[PDB]
Structures are given as structure tokens and as C-alpha cells.
A paper describes a structure:
Typhoid toxin is an A2B5 protein toxin and an important virulence factor for the human-adapted bacterial pathogen Salmonella enterica serovar Typhi, the causative agent of typhoid fever. Typhoid toxin contains two enzymatic subunits, PltA and CdtB, which dock onto a pentameric delivery platform composed of the protein PltB. It was recently reported that the same enzymatic subunits can assemble with a different delivery platform composed of the protein PltC, forming a distinct version of typhoid toxin. Here, we determined atomic-level structures of the pentameric PltC subunit, the fully assembled PltC typhoid toxin, and the PltC pentamers in complex with glycan receptors.
To gain insight into the molecular mechanism of the pentamerization of B subunits, we determined the crystal structure of the PltC homopentamer at a resolution of 1.33 Å and compared this to analogous structures of PltB and ArtB homopentamers solved previously. Size exclusion chromatography indicated that, as expected, PltB and PltC both form stable homogeneous pentamers. Close inspection of their oligomerization interfaces revealed that the monomers of PltC, PltB, and ArtB interact via similar structural elements—mainly loops L1 and L2, β strands β1, β2, and β5 and helix α1—to form a homopentamer. However, while there is appreciable overlap in the intersubunit interactions of ArtB and PltC, the specific residues and chemical interactions involved in the intersubunit interactions of the PltB homopentamer differ substantially. Electrostatic surface potential analysis of the interfaces of PltC-PltC, PltB-PltB, and ArtB-ArtB shows that it is mainly electrostatic interactions that facilitate subunit pentamerization. Importantly, the charge distribution of the PltB interface is substantially different from that of the PltC or ArtB interface. Consistent with our observations above that PltB and PltC do not interact, the interfaces between PltC and PltB exhibit significant electrostatic repulsion, most notably via D83PltC-E84PltB and E49PltC-E24PltB, which likely presents a substantial barrier to PltC-PltB complex formation. In contrast, the PltC-ArtB interface shows electrostatic attraction interactions, consistent with our observations that these proteins can form heteropentamers. Together, these results indicate that S. Typhi produces distinct PltB and PltC versions of typhoid toxin and that electrostatic repulsion at the subunit interface likely plays a major role in preventing the formation of heteromeric delivery platforms.
Author numbering:
A (entry chain B), B (entry chain A), D (entry chain E): 22 to 139
C (entry chain D): 22 to 140
E (entry chain C): 22 to 145
Amino acid sequence: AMADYDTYVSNVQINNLSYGVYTSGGKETQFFCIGLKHGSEAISINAMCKVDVYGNHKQGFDNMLNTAKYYYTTGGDVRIYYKENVWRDPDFKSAFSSRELIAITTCSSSSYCMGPTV
Amino acid sequence: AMADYDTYVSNVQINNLSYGVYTSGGKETQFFCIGLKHGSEAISINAMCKVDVYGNHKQGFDNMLNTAKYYYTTGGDVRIYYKENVWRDPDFKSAFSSRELIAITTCSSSSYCMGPTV
Amino acid sequence: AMADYDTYVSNVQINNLSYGVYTSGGKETQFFCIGLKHGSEAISINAMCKVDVYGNHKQGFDNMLNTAKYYYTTGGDVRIYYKENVWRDPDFKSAFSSRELIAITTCSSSSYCMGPTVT
Amino acid sequence: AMADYDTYVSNVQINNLSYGVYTSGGKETQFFCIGLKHGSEAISINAMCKVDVYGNHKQGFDNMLNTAKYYYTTGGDVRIYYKENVWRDPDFKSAFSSRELIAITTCSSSSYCMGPTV
Amino acid sequence: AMADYDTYVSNVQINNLSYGVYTSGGKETQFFCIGLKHGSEAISINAMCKVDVYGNHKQGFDNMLNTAKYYYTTGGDVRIYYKENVWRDPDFKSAFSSRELIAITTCSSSSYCMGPTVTNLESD
């Protein structure tokens, strides 16, 4: 199976965004975070972030940000692939999330979203 | 004829998208994949991908991604040119596709799309 | 007059767009092409293209692509400046066009588009 | 707590935007500045700016500009994190403010915006 | 006062836009030009341009272009800051404009636009 694609939430909507600049561990960073809803269902796995110069995958900062902003605009159904327990900055983890955003795929029905499933 | 333009599907719509980051073969990659339908019907050749640091044509990652997102938004009729049997990562081919996306052109009628035919 | 601004069509609409990647003449390229509307016909006329690593003006590939996509979306009337007889790859010229896209300007009326004119 | 995240205004709207190029202190700059409202309420903390080659955080100019422009388009409620007393150019400070823009987060309700509140 | 911010036109709309490529002085350039109106009136200062590799401020070409395109799309009221007598190639000035685009700010009402204003009636 694809490394880092094993943990996801499906048929969610991106209902909040954050974008900022921040010094972390003595390095100048950019970050963004997505916040999620699942229609009217309560979701606890509801935030994930990406940082330009830290993480398991530094590539794709601008493309992932633009992709997140696209689905915030449409409110469309997506699946979010993420990795738990990534961010080591304790102030960032408590403010935003520990989770690193890995991929965003669309869902065309209540049962199908693109990408691998477990 | 144009090299790599011999294999295409016409009058389709991009009805799904994926964008992600992924380690493949020791390289840090970005990728995106488009999912297709043919009007009211599903089609069997229905996913094509592009990878920033692998493939027959590594250029144009951001422009092809922006172009794909554009037609996902409009739902317009397009022709997709693609190349078969490209991606060699077995986990990736199984989750997404083995096909490399080459070009996207528009269709102004049920019978005409821009670009060369065979 | 401005070099490369002598040849244009005014008050046209872009009704088709192509974007691709392609190996031409030993180089890896990106290109896009616009097709122009002719009455109610589906087939476009006067297609014009831009290539990132070939042409009289290699600069501005992404900005010209985004400008072309913009007017394809709005369907607005534009003036297109282009250079005839540029592309030499025969397969490309047969598939798309020989013309290089130089500039796109708006038309605010049936009578006025921005940019220089010739008589 | 996150350094530079202690000062913010919540549930505001970006109702004006400036973008320009400018020589400041012998350096060629770009800048943008956001103007804020909060519905009908009189606010005094209502302008924040970012400069490409000056400030505590020079990274993220284009991404922050595009983020500010998006919320100006939607008129949606946001939280603005900012740093007071940053700009030293007296002419710039008089025309806009001394405040450096740090982050923009969305507000999904009258009581919630993403990001830390301490 | 902010250098290069002394001449502007307020409460205008961008109602035309040009983008192109052009060779000048041995350099390959990109440029764009905006056309303006003041509601239903034509104005005297109605065009201004930015060039990627010429001008007093070469930075910000893409950001300025995207900003101008945005306001052309929305038709919203803006203030345009510009500098006179920059483009001195007569065929470019005849085709487009002599003025360099410096900044674009919004006007949220008929009475307010963002950005610096001159000190007084004589710009002392």
C-alpha cells in the first residue's frame, strides 16, 4: 500500500482555513491548516496542517494550499489523507493540530472518493 | 504525427480530482490524478495522473494541475491525451493509475474537440 | 509601430483551448493553443499558440495561458495580436497552428479594442 | 503559546485592500495592506500590512496577498493576527499603519475562528 | 509623503485590459495596460501600464497583473496610483500609455479609498 495513505476521513467538507507565518524551532515558516465538518455529523478528526519547511513531506506547499482553498470555496465533498502525531512544536500542536495533511481527493458519491482505501 | 498524442479519449468530463504528496522510489513527489466520466456513463479508462519528478514529461506540473481543476469546476467536455504504462510504482498504479496525462483540450460540440486525431 | 503588433483580429471570441506537454525538435516543451469562434460553427478558426521554449517571445508563457483561459471562460470580445508562420515542427503545425500568440486585449465596444491599429 | 500569535481581532471582514510597489529605505518593495470592518461597529484597529522585503516575517508575501484577496471577495468573517509597531518608514506608517499582518483564519460562527486565542 | 504616491485617480473602474509580449532595447519584455472609466464618464488619465523588465519599479509584475485582472472582472471602484512620463518609446506610448502603474487600492464608498493622499491642495 502507499506509504502515508493509510489514515483518512471520507465525505467531509473543508469549512475553515488558516494561513500564517511563524517562527518554529528557530526557523521561518509558513503554514496552513484546514478545518473539517461532516455535514451535520460531529467530527473530532477535524484539523490538519502543512508547513513549508517542516514535516514528512515539504513539497507541494503552494499547490496543497491552493487545493484546500478551492474546496473551501466550493464546499464539495472530499477525502482527506493525513498523518497523526507529526508536529513537534508543542505551541503549534495545541493551537492547530498535530496532524500533517497528505492528500485531498474528491468524492463523487456517498461511497466513492478517489484514492486508496484500507 | 505528434509523438505521445496517439492515445486519447474524447467528449469526457473530469468528474474527480486527487492531489497529494508521496515518497516514491526514494524521491519526494507531488502528484495529481483526474477521474473521468463520459456524460452519463462510467468509462473504464477513467484515471490519468501527472507526477512532478517522474514521467516522460516532467514540465508543466502546476499548469496541468490548474487546467485539470478548471475543467473539474466547469464540467466542460474535453479530450484527454494520455500515455499508457508509465508509472512503475506498484502501490501507486494500484491506488491511482499507470497512465501519464499528456494534454487536455476542449470540445465545442459532441463531435469536435481541438487537437490531432488518429 | 510596435514590432510584432502589425497582425491582429479584432472583436473575436475564444471558443476552444488546448494545453499540453510535448517533445519537439529535441526539447521538452509546454504549449497552449486558442481557437476562435466563427459564427455558430463548432470548429474553431485562426488557431494561435504559444510554446514555453520556442518562438519569437519565450517569456510570458504562464501569464499568456492564464489570460487566454480567462477570455475562454468569459466569452468576451477581444483583439488578438499574432505572428504568422512561426512554428516549424510539421506535426505540431498540422495538429494545431503555425501562428504565435503575441498579445490579447479587450474590446469595450464593437468599435474599440485596446492596442495599436494598422490601416 | 505561539510567538507573534497573541494579538488578533476576530469576526472582522476585509472591506478594503491596497497593493503597490514602493521604494522604502533604499530598497525596492512590494506591499499590501488590508482594511477591516466589523459589521456596524466602530473599530480603531482596522489596518494591517505585509511587505515583501521588510518585517519580522518576510516569507509568504504572495500566499498572504492571495489569501487577503480571497476574503475581500467573499466578505466572510475572519480573524486577523498582527504584530503592533513594526514598520519604521514614517511615510508608510502615516499612510497605512505600523502593524504587520501575521495570519488570517476563517470564522465559521459568531463564536469560533480557527487558531489560538490566549 | 510616500515617494511615487502623489499622482492618482480615485473612484474609477478598470474597463479594459491588455497583456502582451514585446521586444524593446534588446530585452524580451512582458507588459500589461489598464484602461479606466469614472462611472459613465470618460476621464483624461485613462490608461497606465507596467512592464516586467523596465520602469521605476520592476518588482511585482505578476501580482500587479493579477490585481488588475481581478478589478476588471469585478468592475469595483478603485484608486490607481501612477507615475507620468515613464514609457518614452513613442510607438508604445501611442499604442498604450506613457504612465507607469504604481498601486491599486479599493474604494469602499463614494467618499473613501484606501491609501495615502496628498497633504493639501498644492501637495506641499
